Structures are given as structure tokens and as C-alpha cells.
Design a protein around this ligand. Structure first.
Ligand SMILES: [Cl-]
Ligand SMILES: [Cl-]
Ligand SMILES: [Mn+2]
Ligand SMILES: [Mn+2]
Length: 191
DNA sequence: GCCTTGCCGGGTAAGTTCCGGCGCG
DNA sequence: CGCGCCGGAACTTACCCGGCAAGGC
């Protein structure tokens, strides 16, 4: 499914560089936000926003995509109870992702929280349970990896992908045409 | 000879929840 | 009155990045 793949990709970005927020305001007012932030304006507008917009249209979500410029980064934001729960329930059921969704999610998580040099293959996150799920998926895909506490200070774990399986990881996972290619993977393929 | 990877410090790119406003039953 | 989109941004915790050296083949 094209929509489930894009969805899993976006969830990867949300988990890695954004979030899902249920806000309560003065006067019993409220808001539900789907958020992805990124320093690069181009990435948010040229790569991420069009995918989100496709999803919004497919799901008949009436809300608009907002791009807010902040001091340190751009924010892509959709204010939508419907889209919020769509992603929050998907995240709840993450262990049940099929292979396609797994790969889309890993791509997204990597763009957001991965080692972009690709000299080493690493993903940082404070959620060990999350990295452990990804570890299992990678193993099933034949990509060896380890999880260690990379930063004792702030308690951020790292998922290190064995360079023995660099080709398999990059070609089979980052470069799968089953769903949107991460920018650096698209570049490699077009050379 | 060199690759790999745990480990750790460097200079910062994300995240999180406020605010005032509007719309609508 | 009770909720849910919009637009902005202040505030908080950094961001992944990259060097080093131990191990192992
Ligand atoms: Cl990438
Ligand atoms: Cl509304
Ligand atoms: Mn990021
Ligand atoms: Mn953070």
C-alpha cells in the first residue's frame, strides 16, 4: 500500500525529529498537532511537505499544512484531531508493521535521527524500546546491529549498524523503491 | 595495515507547550 | 459554552558529528 508506506515514512520523521501533541488551552479549548521539525527549509518544503499533503488528501483531512519558521529550525505542522489519532494509533501498533512499513519507518527514522555521513551507520534515540524494535526488524532483514548507551549524560542510546552489512542496509533498506527514497539515497541512485 | 565500533567531548538542531485569535454546533 | 483549527514563537534540551583507541583479523 502506497498510503501505509508514506505513513510509516512520516511516522519515522515524526518520531525522529517531531512529535504528536494533544494540547489543552484556556476556555476548554484544545488542539491536536502532527509535527516534524528540521533545520533545512528545503527538506521540509521540497521533500516532507508534499508527502504529508498527499496523506492529508488521501485521508480526507481538512486541515492545512503549516510551515512555521523558528529561530533554530522550521516546523511542519498539521493541526488535526483526525491526523493526530491516525499517527498515534499507528505508533501504538508499530510492532505489527509489515515489511514495507518497517522499511519506510526505518528510512524515516534514519533521515531524522541517523548518521547522515553514511561513513558510519547509526541512529540515536532516547527511547531504547523503540531502537530495540528496529533492531529486531533489522536482524530479520539480515542487517546486524547493536544497541548501546552512547551518551550517559543525557541518556541517549545509539543503534549501530554493522558496516559488514553496509551494502545490504543502504541498498536494500535506504534505497528500496517500495516507498519514498530518503534524499541522500535518491542522490546515490541517480549518481 | 587497516577496518570496525564503543566511548566520549564538541557546537548545536531539534522538540514542547505556551499565547491570542477564529470557527462552529 | 465547549471544542477544534490557525499563526506565531519562546523556552528547553541540544544536534548528530567526528576523533581516539582497543580489538581482531
Ligand atoms: Cl539518510
Ligand atoms: Cl475547528
Ligand atoms: Mn534530525
Ligand atoms: Mn531533542
Amino acid at each position: 500500500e502506497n498510503v501505509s508506506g508514506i505513513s510509516a515514512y512520516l511516522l519515522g520523521l515524526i518520531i525522529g525529529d517531531g512529535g504528536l501533541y494533544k494540547l489543552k488551552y484556556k476556555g476548554n479549548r484544545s488542539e491536536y498537532r502532527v509535527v516534524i521539525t528540521q533545520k533545512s527549509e528545503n527538506l521540509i518544503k521540497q521533500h516532507i511537505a508534499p508527502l504529508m499533503q498527499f496523506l492529508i488528501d488521501e485521508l480526507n483531512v481538512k486541515s492545512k499544512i503549516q510551515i512555521v519558521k523558528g529561530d533554530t529550525r522550521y516546523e511542519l505542522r498539521v493541526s488535526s484531531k483526525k491526523l493526530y489519532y491516525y499517527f498515534a494509533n499507528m505508533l501504538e501498533r508499530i510492532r505489527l508493521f509489515n515489511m514495507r512499513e518497517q522499511i519506510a519507518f526505518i528510512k524515516g527514522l534514519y533521515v531524522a535521527a541517523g548518521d547522515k555521513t553514511l561513513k558510519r551507520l547509526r541512529i540515536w534515540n532516547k527511547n531504547k524500546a523503540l531502537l530495540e524494535i528496529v533492531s529486531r526488524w533489522l536482524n530479520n532483514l539480515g542487517v546486524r546491529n547493536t544497541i548501546h548507551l552512547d551518551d550517559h549524560r543525557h541518556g541517549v542510546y545509539v543503534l549501530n549498524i554493522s558496516l559488514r552489512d553496509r551494502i545490504k542496509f543502504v541498498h536494500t533498506i535506504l534505497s528500496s523503491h517500495l516507498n519514498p527514497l530518503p534524499p541522500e539515497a535518491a542522490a546515490l541512485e541517480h549518481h
